[PDB]
Design an enzyme around this catalytic site. Structure first.
Site, PDB file in Angstrom:
ATOM      1  N   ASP A 127      31.522  46.949  44.069  1.00 22.20           N
ATOM      2  CA  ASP A 127      32.101  46.888  42.671  1.00 22.20           C
ATOM      3  C   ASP A 127      31.799  45.467  42.007  1.00 22.20           C
ATOM      4  OD1 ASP A 127      33.631  47.387  40.449  1.00 22.20           O
ATOM      5  OD2 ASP A 127      35.486  47.177  41.282  1.00 22.20           O
ATOM      6  N   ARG A 131      34.609  40.739  36.657  1.00 22.54           N
ATOM      7  CA  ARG A 131      36.031  40.652  36.992  1.00 22.54           C
ATOM      8  C   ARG A 131      36.360  40.444  38.405  1.00 22.54           C
ATOM      9  NH1 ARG A 131      34.446  45.492  35.706  1.00 22.54           N
ATOM     10  NH2 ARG A 131      34.229  47.035  37.598  1.00 22.54           N
ATOM     11  N   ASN A 132      35.210  40.656  39.363  1.00 21.08           N
ATOM     12  CA  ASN A 132      35.298  40.749  40.999  1.00 21.08           C
ATOM     13  C   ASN A 132      34.811  39.355  41.542  1.00 21.08           C
ATOM     14  OD1 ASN A 132      37.190  42.723  41.304  1.00 21.08           O
ATOM     15  ND2 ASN A 132      35.096  44.151  41.114  1.00 21.08           N
ATOM     16  N   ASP A 145      36.157  40.225  46.933  1.00 21.81           N
ATOM     17  CA  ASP A 145      36.509  41.667  47.047  1.00 21.81           C
ATOM     18  C   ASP A 145      35.633  42.612  47.536  1.00 21.81           C
ATOM     19  OD1 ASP A 145      38.972  40.873  46.144  1.00 21.81           O
ATOM     20  OD2 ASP A 145      39.244  42.226  44.722  1.00 21.81           O
TER      21      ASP A 145
HETATM   22  C1  Y7W Z   1      37.560  37.427  49.551  1.00 20.99           C
HETATM   23  O1  Y7W Z   1      38.778  38.265  49.696  1.00 20.99           O
HETATM   24  C2  Y7W Z   1      38.419  39.648  49.892  1.00 20.99           C
HETATM   25  C3  Y7W Z   1      37.286  40.161  50.278  1.00 20.99           C
HETATM   26  C4  Y7W Z   1      37.102  41.562  50.669  1.00 20.99           C
HETATM   27  C5  Y7W Z   1      37.891  42.464  50.337  1.00 20.99           C
HETATM   28  F1  Y7W Z   1      37.603  43.568  50.870  1.00 20.99           F
HETATM   29  C6  Y7W Z   1      39.121  42.033  49.893  1.00 20.99           C
HETATM   30  C7  Y7W Z   1      39.419  40.835  49.598  1.00 20.99           C
HETATM   31  C8  Y7W Z   1      40.935  40.510  49.249  1.00 20.99           C
HETATM   32  O2  Y7W Z   1      41.594  41.414  48.840  1.00 20.99           O
HETATM   33  N1  Y7W Z   1      41.139  39.198  48.796  1.00 20.99           N
HETATM   34  C9  Y7W Z   1      42.211  38.960  48.284  1.00 20.99           C
HETATM   35  C10 Y7W Z   1      42.293  37.834  47.203  1.00 20.99           C
HETATM   36  C11 Y7W Z   1      41.596  38.307  46.102  1.00 20.99           C
HETATM   37  C12 Y7W Z   1      41.582  37.567  44.879  1.00 20.99           C
HETATM   38  C13 Y7W Z   1      42.392  36.170  44.884  1.00 20.99           C
HETATM   39  C14 Y7W Z   1      42.317  35.537  43.454  1.00 20.99           C
HETATM   40  N2  Y7W Z   1      42.661  36.176  42.468  1.00 20.99           N
HETATM   41  N3  Y7W Z   1      42.615  35.140  41.361  1.00 20.99           N
HETATM   42  C15 Y7W Z   1      42.964  35.632  40.088  1.00 20.99           C
HETATM   43  C16 Y7W Z   1      42.036  36.513  39.509  1.00 20.99           C
HETATM   44  C17 Y7W Z   1      44.334  35.976  40.056  1.00 20.99           C
HETATM   45  F2  Y7W Z   1      44.790  35.946  38.443  1.00 20.99           F
HETATM   46  F3  Y7W Z   1      44.783  37.000  40.356  1.00 20.99           F
HETATM   47  F4  Y7W Z   1      45.203  34.910  40.488  1.00 20.99           F
HETATM   48  C18 Y7W Z   1      42.505  33.800  41.996  1.00 20.99           C
HETATM   49  N4  Y7W Z   1      42.473  32.748  41.300  1.00 20.99           N
HETATM   50  C19 Y7W Z   1      42.051  34.049  43.291  1.00 20.99           C
HETATM   51  C20 Y7W Z   1      41.821  33.180  44.271  1.00 20.99           C
HETATM   52  N5  Y7W Z   1      41.211  33.251  45.395  1.00 20.99           N
HETATM   53  O3  Y7W Z   1      41.862  31.947  43.928  1.00 20.99           O
HETATM   54  C21 Y7W Z   1      43.095  36.054  45.911  1.00 20.99           C
HETATM   55  C22 Y7W Z   1      43.086  36.871  47.103  1.00 20.99           C
END
Ligand code: Y7W
Length: 264
Positions: A127, A131-132, A145
């Site tokens: 994906d 957005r990811n 992700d």
């Molecule tokens: C590397 O992670 C993975 C790798 C493989 C997998 F299969 C899954 C994951 C996973 O689930 N990760 C959990 C996660 C995902 C995104 C944020 C995040 N999101 N955001 C923004 C959009 C918001 F708005 F959501 F806050 C950040 N700034 C974030 C930030 N990290 O600063 C935080 C934790």
């Protein structure tokens, strides 16, 4: 892989999404982290937990690091590298006001480096899209992700005919046969380059998902964004050959990107 919640300090909510609320915090009072509190019923939690170490081993400077999980409570938490500028899609839209075109190519190079590393492990993202991707305090874009869609429970998102499937980022063999490979991540990378050069416009905006799937099957492709030079457009277009075996590898795209950087 198991992080003790006693070692987390929660400092501010960053936002929410498909898989839960995200907070900024510190680990052991010192290290910045992002904490996602997984939305109940959204993911195959037992399977994700057993394989959290697999994703934790994928360490590359342009991949958002997964630091671990907190699983001795409901909801489970996923702890990652903190990306202060948030998602790339919104960050591109904010950039419209102030940017140099050379920064757009540097963003493509950052994502391509991460994807060349995933390709070297035969690890599918599934994906890849703006957005990811996330952006740090220094403006570095990193891929996030990676591989997560294999653990999503909602068929509306994982099925090629689900209303929420990433149709606009999928090649013909995924839309028709659900055939994922390194070459479907290549196709999505070309669409992501288009999203970067269009400063966050939606691909095929005039069309519905079903019309977009037909448009792609007929061989129609995204136009050159006005910020992309013909050399940059040639790179993104190379990701969209109908035949998957004709699309380049991420090693080839990285070299092409570095050539355009060195020339323009
Ligand atoms: C590397 O992670 C993975 C790798 C493989 C997998 F299969 C899954 C994951 C996973 O689930 N990760 C959990 C996660 C995902 C995104 C944020 C995040 N999101 N955001 C923004 C959009 C918001 F708005 F959501 F806050 C950040 N700034 C974030 C930030 N990290 O600063 C935080 C934790």
């Amino acid at each position: 892989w198991e992080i003790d919640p006693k070692d987390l300090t929660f400092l501010k909510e960053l936002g929410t999404g498909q898989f839960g609320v995200v907070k900024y915090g510190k680990w052991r009072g010192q290290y910045d982290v992002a904490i996602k509190m997984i939305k109940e019923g959204s993911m195959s939690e037992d399977e994700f937990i057993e394989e959290a170490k697999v994703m934790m081993n994928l360490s590359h400077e342009k991949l958002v690091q997964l630091y671990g999980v907190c699983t001795k409570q409901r909801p489970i938490f996923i702890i990652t590298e903190y990306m202060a500028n948030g998602c790339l899609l919104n960050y591109l839209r904010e950039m419209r006001h102030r940017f140099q075109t050379q920064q757009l190519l540097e963003m493509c190079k950052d994502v391509c480096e991460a994807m060349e590393y995933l390709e070297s492990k035969q690890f599918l993202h599934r994906d890849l899209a703006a957005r990811n991707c996330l952006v740090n305090d220094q403006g570095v874009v990193k891929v996030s992700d990676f591989g997560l869609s294999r653990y999503v429970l909602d068929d509306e998102y994982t099925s090629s005919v689900g209303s929420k499937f990433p149709v606009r980022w999928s090649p013909p063999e995924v839309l028709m046969y659900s055939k994922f490979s390194s070459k479907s991540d290549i196709w999505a990378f070309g669409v992501l380059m288009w999203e970067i050069y269009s400063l966050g416009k939606m691909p095929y905006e005039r069309f519905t998902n079903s019309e977009t799937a037909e448009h792609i099957a007929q061989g129609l492709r995204l136009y050159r964004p006005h910020l992309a030079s013909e050399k940059v457009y040639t790179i993104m277009y190379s990701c969209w050959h109908e035949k998957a075996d004709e699309r380049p590898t991420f090693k080839i795209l990285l070299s092409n990107i570095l050539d355009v950087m060195d020339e323009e």
